[PDB]
Enzyme design. Sequence first.
Site, PDB file in Angstrom:
ATOM      1  N   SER A 236      42.170  39.339  51.561  1.00 23.93           N
ATOM      2  CA  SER A 236      40.936  38.842  52.130  1.00 23.93           C
ATOM      3  C   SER A 236      41.007  38.877  53.650  1.00 23.93           C
ATOM      4  O   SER A 236      42.066  38.699  54.239  1.00 23.93           O
ATOM      5  CB  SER A 236      40.678  37.419  51.636  1.00 23.93           C
ATOM      6  OG  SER A 236      39.571  36.823  52.283  1.00 23.93           O
TER       7      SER A 236
ATOM      8  N   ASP B 217      42.486  37.227  30.989  1.00 22.48           N
ATOM      9  CA  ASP B 217      43.347  36.782  32.078  1.00 22.48           C
ATOM     10  C   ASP B 217      43.799  37.972  32.907  1.00 22.48           C
ATOM     11  O   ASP B 217      44.733  38.673  32.545  1.00 22.48           O
ATOM     12  CB  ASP B 217      44.557  36.044  31.490  1.00 22.48           C
ATOM     13  CG  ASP B 217      45.512  35.540  32.546  1.00 22.48           C
ATOM     14  OD1 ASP B 217      45.137  35.543  33.730  1.00 22.48           O
ATOM     15  OD2 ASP B 217      46.646  35.130  32.183  1.00 22.48           O
TER      16      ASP B 217
END
EC number: 3.4.23.22
Length: 330
Positions: A199, A35
Amino acid sequence: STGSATTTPIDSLDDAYITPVQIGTPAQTLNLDFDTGSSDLWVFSSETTASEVDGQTIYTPSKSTTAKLLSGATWSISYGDGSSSSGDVYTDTVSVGGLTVTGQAVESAKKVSSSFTEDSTIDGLLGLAFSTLNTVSPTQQKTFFDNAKASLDSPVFTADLGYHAPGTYNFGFIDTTAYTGSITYTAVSTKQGFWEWTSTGYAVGSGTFKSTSIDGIADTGTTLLYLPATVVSAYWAQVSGAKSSSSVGGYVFPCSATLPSFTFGVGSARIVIPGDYIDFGPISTGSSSCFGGIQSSAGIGINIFGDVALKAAFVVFNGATTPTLGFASK
């Protein structure tokens, strides 16, 4: 040194991925959920409340000659999905894919929430975010990666998750045969303890690319792709009959649909998520309404590039002095 381990979807939907981890001496192999959005290595154990164990493999520290109780240490964590667990702490030898760390903090669960009990395939979590998020008190502990880093050939790990198929976590090296083209690296902020990046935009299907900054986290422990409501609405508008269902808890779509791809930007590079990666199947057994793999982050408070996005790429988690993230197509 290096390590390399195969990671395997837990079910036919790729709801999560499990990776075998050797703990203790002799080794006890547990299948952990790696994770990159948390920083605790915790396991089901011989100390876990009996009624809260249902099929998981447990760690029994009393059977490990290298286990040592970390005196006075406790831990307690809550995840973004509302699940939680807590307990005490041992140090022990932990190996992943041939890479060994001695003295790793292994957090033994005394209690786990229902979601964990109900998932027989996940024996615990191995956190790969920054150690500043580790919950051990009164002395915070380091992640497996943080402990291994100095010994690694290069201070990196990579995630190569499969679509409906196994994939690989590598530590200490970049497998140049595992991706196509080049890896595009992008800046990371560690201010919130995550692999947080920005992004450069998105496209839906064959549509034009929208240049827009989307701050979010690279999180292998989250199943879906959570993005701003504007982006998500633009995606689902291209699927006839798709709608946001408050009763179900997100966007659903007719299972008869053909889903468009979704592209996200990494600098000037582009990662394409095929439409089929966005299908999470019937909302309940036998339903013709299917659950979407792109969902709104509104009210999460952060955008999350979870497995839906990451499995479309070869992803480098570069733990150099100034960390960065790399993405390649594959």
